[PDB]
UniProtKB/Swiss-Prot annotation:
Effect upon mutating residue 39 to G: In sporadic cancers; somatic mutation
Outcome of swapping residue 12 to S: In sporadic cancers; somatic mutation
Result when mutating residue 146 to S: In sporadic cancers; somatic mutation
Site (Interaction with DNA): 24
Effect of residue 186 to Q: In a familial cancer not matching LFS; germline mutation and in sporadic cancers; somatic mutation
Impact upon substituting residue 100 to P: In LFS; germline mutation and in sporadic cancers; somatic mutation
Effect of residue 144 to N: In sporadic cancers; somatic mutation
Effect of residue 142 to S: In LFS; germline mutation and in sporadic cancers; somatic mutation
Residues of the full protein shown: 97 to 289 of 393
Effect upon mutating residue 182 to S: In LFS; germline mutation and in sporadic cancers; somatic mutation
UniProt name for this protein: Cellular tumor antigen p53
Result of altering residue 60 to S: In sporadic cancers; somatic mutation
């Protein structure tokens, strides 16, 4: 099982999220209290990389999903057969991969040879000039309620900062729910606090 231990590392690596709120029109919204992202299928999911100092050239940013619950954690998170077989290809992403990056022609996808786990990696870019963070647009290509894969089992996304040689520079994570009404579902999951 890949580590999910938070690790700010040498560069002070942390995640940020847009403050999108829970209006019914929201397609992507993050709950600080639950550290949980609520997303519509295949919609832009902005994840902000915040660093205290700029990591070197060739730094890369990896995303990987694992099941949150210990009893499922060894199971590879992958798209259900239906979504696997859907005609929603962007021509870069493997059809089985739950997490894609959109709007980045330098995206790289990995099926780990030994663990079989899926990940998607992009070059780290410094914040645009005048910005304080780097935003990656992720897409989640299968629903939490999909019976053929996650089937209501919660998943985590682990975001890793690695150098060009693959050494770990930093790590963070957040829970993800892929659903029809993220605004409503966030608001609802938060009313039980
Ligand atoms: As999202
Ligand atoms: Zn699915």
């Amino acid at each position: 099982v890949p580590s999910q231990k938070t690790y700010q590392g040498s560069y002070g690596f942390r995640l940020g999220f847009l403050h999108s709120g829970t209006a019914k029109s929201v397609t992507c919204t993050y709950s600080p209290a639950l550290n949980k992202m609520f997303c519509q299928l295949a919609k832009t999911c902005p994840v902000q990389l915040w660093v205290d100092s700029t990591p070197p050239p060739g730094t890369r940013v990896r995303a990987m999903a694992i099941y949150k619950q210990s009893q499922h954690m060894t199971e590879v998170v992958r798209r259900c057969p239906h979504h696997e077989r859907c005609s929603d290809s962007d021509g870069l992403a493997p059809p089985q991969h739950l997490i894609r990056v959109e709007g980045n022609l330098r995206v790289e996808y990995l099926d780990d040879r030994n663990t079989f786990r899926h990940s998607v990696v992009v070059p780290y870019e410094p914040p645009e000039v005048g910005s304080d963070c780097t935003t990656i647009h992720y897409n989640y290509m299968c629903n939490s309620s999909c019976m053929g894969s996650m089937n209501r089992r919660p998943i985590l996304t682990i975001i890793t900062l690695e150098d060009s040689s693959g050494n770990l520079l930093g790590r963070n994570s957040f829970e993800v729910r892929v659903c029809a009404c993220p605004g409503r579902d966030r608001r609802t999951e938060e009313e039980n606090l």
